Every structure is written in C-alpha cells, then in structure tokens.
C-alpha cells in the first residue's frame, strides 16, 4: 500500500497541486525527477486533452490506454508513462473540479496492483524504479 | 477513431518510456 504510494500515488498528488513538494518522501522527491522529465518530454510530442463527465468514462478510456501500453512489453520506462498519464488525467479532474480525481487515482492503484505490481517486485522494486531515475 | 485516439496516446508513452529504459539516442549525428 506505500510501493504503490511512493512510486505512483505521491507524484500524482503533487502534480494535481492537492500537496507540495516537499510533502513528498526523500525517496519521492528523487524519481520525481525522472517523471517530471518524462511529463515535459510527452508535452514536446503531443497535447493531450480529455472530456471526462463521469465516473464510468474515466474507467473505459484509463484502461483502455494502460492496457494498450502494455498489451507488448512492460518495463521501467512503461512504468514512468502510466504514472504520469494517471497524473495528466487527475490534473483534468482537478481543474475541471468534477470532484473525480480521487477516482483516477483509485483505476490506476488498482490497475497497478494487479497487472504490474508482481513484475515489478519480479524485477527489484521501488530500488529498480529508483536507479532508473538516476538513468 | 476514439479507440484510434487511445492508440496514439499509449503509442507515445510506450516509445517515450522505451527509449528512456534503453539506450537509445537519436539517430543523426552530425559529424564535424
């Protein structure tokens, strides 16, 4: 319930400005650095933009973009894409103020749970994510 | 299209990630 939070919820919380920066953990504030360089690296190639009203569509079109990425491979690099696309959809919610960030984060828990979580533990864990970030 | 829309989104999180968790670098170099 933390490698979950420390490697995915906390980013998004920060991103979605509901905490600061500093709120984050040390280990946190590290690969924070590799997520924001992703962020700004995805924002150079494409704009994205969402028209979520509801609870039922934020399901539909979240698991229909994690799951396409990754239907092939999963890897670190992956990884760093679904947090911060979990984050970019939250951040809508967020300005929008539906009130539906909460169920953002909640898809992409449990998507991260049940489909990557045992690949990550299979492939050294928040310690891996953290050398990628220095990488 | 909606479904293609989804396509191309988890088009460039996959290629973006791929090319952070391998080596990979630009194809060009210019060469003085």
């Known amino acids: 319930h933390n490698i979950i939070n420390e490697?995915?919820?906390?980013?998004?919380?920060?991103?979605?400005?509901?905490?600061?920066?500093?709120?984050?953990?040390?280990?946190?504030?590290?690969?924070?650095?590799?997520?924001?360089?992703?962020?700004?690296?995805?924002?150079?190639?494409?704009?994205?933009?969402?028209?979520?009203?509801?609870?039922?569509?934020?399901?539909?079109?979240?698991?229909?973009?994690?799951?396409?990425?990754?239907?092939?491979?999963?890897?670190?690099?992956?990884?760093?894409?679904?947090?911060?696309?979990?984050?970019?959809?939250?951040?809508?919610?967020?300005?929008?103020?539906?009130?539906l960030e909460s169920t953002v984060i909640t898809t992409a828990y449990n998507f991260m749970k049940h489909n990557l979580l045992p690949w990550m533990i299979s492939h050294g864990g928040q310690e891996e994510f953290l050398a990628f970030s220095l990488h | 299209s909606q479904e293609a829309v989804i396509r191309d989104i988890a088009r460039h999180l996959a290629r973006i990630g791929d090319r952070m968790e391998y080596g990979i670098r630009p194809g060009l170099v210019d060469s003085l």
């Open chain 1, 7 to 99: 490697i995915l919820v906390g980013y998004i919380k920060y991103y979605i400005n509901d905490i600061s920066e500093h709120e984050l953990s040390p280990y946190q504030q590290q690969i924070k650095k590799i997520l924001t360089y992703y962020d700004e690296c995805l924002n150079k190639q494409v704009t994205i933009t969402f028209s979520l009203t509801s609870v039922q569509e934020i399901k539909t079109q979240f698991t229909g973009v994690v799951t396409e990425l990754f239907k092939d491979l999963i890897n670190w690099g992956r990884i760093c894409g679904f947090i911060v696309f979990s984050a970019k959809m939250a951040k809508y919610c967020k300005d929008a103020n539906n009130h």
